[PDB]
Every structure is written in C-alpha cells, then in structure tokens.
Amino acid sequence: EPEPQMVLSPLTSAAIFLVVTIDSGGEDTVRDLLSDVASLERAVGFRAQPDGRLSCVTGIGSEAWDRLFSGARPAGLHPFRELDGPVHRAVATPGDLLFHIRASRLDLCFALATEIMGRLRGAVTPQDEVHGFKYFDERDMLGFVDGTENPTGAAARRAVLVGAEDPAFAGGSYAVVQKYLHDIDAWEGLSVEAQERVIGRRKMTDVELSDDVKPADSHVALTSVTGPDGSDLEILRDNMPFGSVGREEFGTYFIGYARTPEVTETMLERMFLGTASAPHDRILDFSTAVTGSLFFTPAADFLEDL
Ligand code: HEM
Ligand SMILES: [Mg+2]
Ligand SMILES: [Mg+2]
Ligand SMILES: [Mg+2]
C-alpha cells in the first residue's frame, strides 16, 4: 500500500543537494509545497522520459518535523549526532528540508530546484546547495570508484525502507548528508599503494584488498559492519563529486540512506572515534566534513496526503 519516494534511483550523472531552514511562520507554505513536490517532479521530468531519470527525494529534519506535524513521529528521527573524535570531528549543521534531486542531466535538476524554491520563496532560508557531477568511470575526487559495494534490488529495499519495525512510517528512509572537502595536495603526496592502504581497494581495478592485507584503519574495513545475527548491516550511498577549481575546492557530497539511522551512525562512530584496532578512518586524514544533517524521507503518500 505505501509507495516509497525514489530512494533507490537508477544511476544518475547529475544531482542537486538543496538544504534549507524553515523561517518562523513558513510551515503552511512548506506543507503546501510538500503536497505538490511529486506533481512538480512529473511536470519537469515527464517530457524527458525515459532517459531524463529525474527524481526528488524530500527529507524533513527532527526539529522541522515537530514544527510541521502533530502526533506520532518516525521512531529514529533525531538531530544529526555530532562526533568529537580525538583527531576528527563530524560537525552538526542546520537543515530542516532536504531536496535530493538526481537526473541524467543537470538542467532537469536545476529546473526542479527552481520550481521548488519558487514555491518556498519567503518561507525558507538557503543553507547548502551543491551541484554534483559524475567524475569519469564513477570515480570520486580521490580517484577511486565510488558505489561498487552498494546493495541492489531486494537487498537495497531491505536495507533502506522502513517496514514492520515502525509500521506507521513504512516505506520511508533515513538520509544522512555530510559535505566533505578533500586535501588533494596531501592525497597526491601518497603513492598509489599508500592510497590503496587508506581506502582498502585497488585504485585502477577496484578489487577489494585481501583479508590479510586490508588495514584495520582502511575506509572499507571501518565501514564494513556485521550485525549480532551475522548478516551485513548495509546503507545505500549516492556520493557526488563537486568543486570549484579557482578556490581549490575538491569535494565529496556524501548521502547515505538506511531503514534506521543506527547503521549509518555505527559507521560514522567507527570512522570518527575508531575501534580497539583503529584510531580512526585514514580517509578522514584527507577529508573534512563541513556539514552534517539527518532527515526522514517519508513514503510518497505521506507527502501527497498533506
Ligand atoms: C568522506 C568522503 C567519502 C568518500 C570519498 C568515500 C569513498 C568510498 C569509496 C571509494 C568506497 C569503496 C567503493 C565502494 O564500495 O563504494 C567506499 C565504500 C564505502 N563507504 Fe565511503 N566514502 C566517504 C564517506 C563515507 C561515509 C561518511 C560513510 C558512512 C557513513 C561511508 C560508507 C561506505 C560504505 C558502507 C562503503 C562500502 C564498504 C563495503 O561494505 O565494502 N562512506 N566509500
Ligand atoms: Mg555515482
Ligand atoms: Mg591544497
Ligand atoms: Mg564486504
């Protein structure tokens, strides 16, 4: 019965991440926009189907939820949890609404962002806006393939969609965003083999390092999580490169979706606070988080019915 938003998108070479705060008294304008956001997605995207692949996933933050709605809330919806590691910090930054806009073309993303922001004029203040672009063969700004071990099909739906554990919000998901900037000069001072040690995969061929070679403080080791029952705890990432050459800004826009924030926050805790065998994730020695926000992306029928 409950239809998910397009959390599980086919691959898209362009994206706009829009994060805004809701102004005092902007709630009615926001509720009106939420009830139309699927209609606007069809209005912009339909004429470019099937290759356009335009979608918007709309998220609401914990504080914004309690300003917009009354009664029961999604069981896991809280402000992003700031992590204060001995070396690396995951900052919490303002954000009430997320529009995760993806397509095969930036123009479609741009036109939908314009229609959305057009309707929210006078009710919201811009916080963050990133225009993301596919970078060669699905690489990120560190020169590694990014997305390889994402779950797909049924395994992806089981990892990202709320079900019987929170029935009133079935078909929703939890999105965590962090905008990362990379120290490309420091990164380029490492050999390819030193970089592979940091990530935990081979750079050109994208083959995972063997169990006896993969460092405990590699990115892949610390973001590989097995639950008590033995099965892998997974998230769905759609990381997007961005930047500005004049400002020497070379970034990764991280977005991770999970059926509970506990899986994503377990990964972040291992990365920023480490484990018995790792001080922290070596990727953070080349990567600074400058935002951090958590959102609930409800079933599409929750937004339509407002
Ligand atoms: C800081 C910028 C980031 C970059 C540049 C980055 C890059 C990558 C790369 C290159 C891989 C290996 C290929 C793949 O399977 O996708 C990877 C894997 C992964 N990343 Fe990250 N990542 C970043 C942040 C994060 C964060 C913040 C999390 C979680 C909160 C995360 C979770 C994962 C997971 C779950 C995998 C799959 C590991 C596995 O099961 O094999 N990443 N990432
Ligand atoms: Mg990609
Ligand atoms: Mg530099
Ligand atoms: Mg694995």
Residue numbers in the entry: 7 to 312
What's the publication's text?
Dye‐decolorising peroxidases (DyPs) are the most recent member of the peroxidase family to be discovered. Three DyPs have been identified in S. lividans; two A‐types (DtpA and DtpAa) and one B‐type (DtpB). Using serial femtosecond X‐ray crystallography (SFX), we have determined the pristine structures of the FeIII and FeIV=O redox states of a B‐type DyP. These structures reveal a water‐free distal heme site that, together with the presence of an asparagine, imply the use of the distal arginine as a catalytic base.
To seek further structural confirmation for a “dry” distal site in FeIII‐DtpB a composite X‐ray structure of FeIII‐DtpB at 100 K was determined. Consistent with the SFX structure, the spectroscopically‐validated 100 K composite structure also revealed a penta‐coordinate and out of plane heme‐Fe and importantly confirmed the absence of a H2O‐Asp unit. The heme redox state in the crystals was corroborated through analysis of larger DtpB crystals suitable to obtain electronic absorbance spectra at 100 K. Identical electronic absorbance bands to those for FeIII‐DtpB and compound I in solution were observed in the crystals. The heme‐Fe in DtpB is penta‐coordinate and sits out of the porphyrin plane towards the proximal His225 ligand. The distal heme site in the immediate vicinity of the Asp/Arg couple of FeIII‐DtpB is thus “dry”, which has the effect of isolating Asp152 from communication with the heme. The absence of a distal heme‐Fe H2O chain in FeIII‐DtpB coincides with the protrusion into the distal site of Asn245, with its side chain amide occupying the spatial position where a H2O molecule (w2) is located and H‐bonded to the distal Asp in the FeIII‐DtpA and FeIII‐DtpAa structures.
